[PDB]
Amino acid sequence: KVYNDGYDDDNYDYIVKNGEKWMDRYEIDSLIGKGSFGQVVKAYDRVEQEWVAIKIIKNKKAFLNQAQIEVRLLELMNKHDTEMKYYIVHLKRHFMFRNHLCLVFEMLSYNLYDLLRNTNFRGVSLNLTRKFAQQMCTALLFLATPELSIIHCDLKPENILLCNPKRSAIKIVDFGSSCQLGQRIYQYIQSRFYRSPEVLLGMPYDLAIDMWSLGCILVEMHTGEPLFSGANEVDQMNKIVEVLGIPPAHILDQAPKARKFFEKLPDGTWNLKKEYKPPGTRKLHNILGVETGGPGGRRAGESGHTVADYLKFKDLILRMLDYDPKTRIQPYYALQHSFFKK
Numbered sequence: 001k002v003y004n005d006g007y008d009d010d011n012y013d014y015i016v017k018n019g020e021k022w023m024d025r026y027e028i029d030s031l032i033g034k035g036s037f038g039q040v041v042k043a044y045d046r047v048e049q050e051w052v053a054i055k056i057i058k059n060k061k062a063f064l065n066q067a068q069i070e071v072r073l074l075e076l077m078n079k080h081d082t083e084m085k086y087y088i089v090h091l092k093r094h095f096m097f098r099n100h101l102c103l104v105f106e107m108l109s110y111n112l113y114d115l116l117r118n119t120n121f122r123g124v125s126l127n128l129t130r131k132f133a134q135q136m137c138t139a140l141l142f143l144a145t146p147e148l149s150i151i152h153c154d155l156k157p158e159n160i161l162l163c164n165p166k167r168s169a170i171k172i173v174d175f176g177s178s179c180q181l182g183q184r185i186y187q188y189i190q191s192r193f194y195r196s197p198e199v200l201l202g203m204p205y206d207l208a209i210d211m212w213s214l215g216c217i218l219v220e221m222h223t224g225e226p227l228f229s230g231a232n233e234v235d236q237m238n239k240i241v242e243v244l245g246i247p248p249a250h251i252l253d254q255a256p257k258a259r260k261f262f263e264k265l266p267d268g269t270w271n272l273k274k275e276y277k278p279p280g281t282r283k284l285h286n287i288l289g290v291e292t293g294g295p296g297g298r299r300a301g302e303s304g305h306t307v308a309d310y311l312k313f314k315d316l317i318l319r320m321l322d323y324d325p326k327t328r329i330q331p332y333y334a335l336q337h338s339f340f341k342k
């Protein structure tokens, strides 16, 4: 009947009211987003004389505590990027209001999946894909600095926002499921399409899981479609295998969940358990259309999409999709790659 003295709905969300004044400071304009965490409103900060986005977390302990983790990591990150040059969303401040934790951010636009929808799911250009890749690798370089050692753990197009819908600048959002290297706790992490092999296999993980996700995201940004669109974990692993082959034996031999997906033969080698293309026969070369006009053949006769350009992009992506987290390309080297030599 009554939720939070009438301030909340039955979903634990604050009932947003256009034009409401909070704390003699914020005038709420409109709802501009929402998700599992709660809501995002556009509000005018009368004290700083600027528009802000306020992420209003649900009035429910599990959501509150997820956002408290997020606040701590944002404060740590922001503290070491006062010029806001490393592509992480800027948290201005936070407060508790009517039993909701509220995170005040810079205003941003919509996400890279919304951008893909805007392309009619045909993909952005290789030149725009490169700009997103360069910013993302710079962000991952910053997260890898020892004082941070932050693993985002949920990179996907939906967690990368445009600053402005007509420009290429981005910020990464949603650190609610993130952790630090010294303090890994979760076994179940990453959204499925973007989930690394080491997580699927139940193995130890580190910051390299985010580079795996990035490789997946960048292919999808150019083709319009997820690279590995599994319906469940077994399907996810099988779709990875179609492109990249059976994982190395030295990895499977140490994987707690190897036998969820694979079986070990008398000769010591591994094969899939028994609808899929044979291992490694769904070539990234063809998914990208390296020699055949890009995805769908649609980049034939366009500038900025040469065979040479595509071969550099393919090479970088295959390094991001190394099965071995020890040898998978790291942010510093990703940034030195020939794909960014223009």
Ligand SMILES: O=C(O)c1nc2ccc(I)cc2c2[nH]c3c(Br)cccc3c12
Pocket: 032, 033, 034, 035, 040, 053, 055, 089, 105, 106, 107, 108, 109, 173, 174, 175
């Ligand atoms: O802060 C975020 O996790 C965040 N997640 C969102 C999820 C769905 C949608 I729909 C919008 C989101 C979002 N939008 C934001 C803006 Br605009 C500025 C700063 C942070 C965020 C943020």
